[PDB]
Amino acid sequence: SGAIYVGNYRVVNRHLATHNDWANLVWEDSSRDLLVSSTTAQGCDTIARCDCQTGVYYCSSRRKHYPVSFSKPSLIFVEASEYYPARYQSHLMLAVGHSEPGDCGGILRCQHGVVGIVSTGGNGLVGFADVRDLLWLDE
Ligand SMILES: Cn1cc(NS(=O)(=O)N2CCC[C@H](C(N)=O)C2)cn1
Numbered sequence: 545s546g547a548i549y550v551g552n553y554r555v556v557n558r559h560l561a562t563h564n565d566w567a568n569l570v571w572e573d574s575s576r577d578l579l580v581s582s583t584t585a586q587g588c589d590t591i592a593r594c595d596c597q598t599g600v601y602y603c604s605s606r607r608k609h610y611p612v613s614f615s616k617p618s619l620i621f622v623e624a625s626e627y628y629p630a631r632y633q634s635h636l637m638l639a640v641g642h643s644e645p646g647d648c649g650g651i652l653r654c655q656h657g658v659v660g661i662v663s664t665g666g667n668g669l670v671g672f673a674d675v676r677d678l679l680w681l682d683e
C-alpha cells in the first residue's frame with residue numbers, strides 16, 4: 545500500500561483505490577494502473593520533472609529502501625492477476641529488485657523528487673508506474 549500526496553491530489557495504484565478514491569475521482573487510467581483522487585488537505589510531496597534512470601524505492605516486504613537503476617517509461621506486457629487480465633501496461637519502468645504485491649504503492653524517488661510508485665513485480669524485477677509526465681499534478 546501507499547500513495548503520493550501533492551497539492552489537492554492523492555495518487556494511488558488504481559487496483560488498490562478505495563470507495564472514497566472513486567467517489568472523489570479526478571483521473572484514472574487502467575493501462576497505467578494509476579488513479580488520482582481529490583483531497584481536502586494540502587499535499588507536500590515534490591514530483592520529479594526529469595529523465596533520471598537511478599533512484600531509491602521503499603520495499604515494505606523488507607522494511608528497507610533500495611537504490612536501483614530503472615528503465616525509461618515504456619509499454620510492457622503484464623501477466624494476468626486477480627485485478628487485471630494479461631495486458632500491456634504503459635508508462636512502466638523496470639529495475640532488478642525484490643517486490644511482492646503488497647509492496648504496491650511504495651515510492652520511487654530520485655534527486656529531483658517523486659518519480660513513481662511500485663506497480664508490478666516477478667522474476668526478480670520490480671516495475672514502477674511513472675508520474676513525471678503528469679504535469680497537471682502541480683496545478
Ligand atoms: C509489486 N508487485 C506486484 C506483483 N505482482 S503482479 O505483478 O502480478 N501485480 C499484481 C497486482 C496488479 C499489478 C498490475 N499493475 O497489473 C501486477 C509483485 N510485486
Ligand SMILES: [Zn+2]
Binds near residue numbers: 592593594
Ligand atoms: Zn530525477
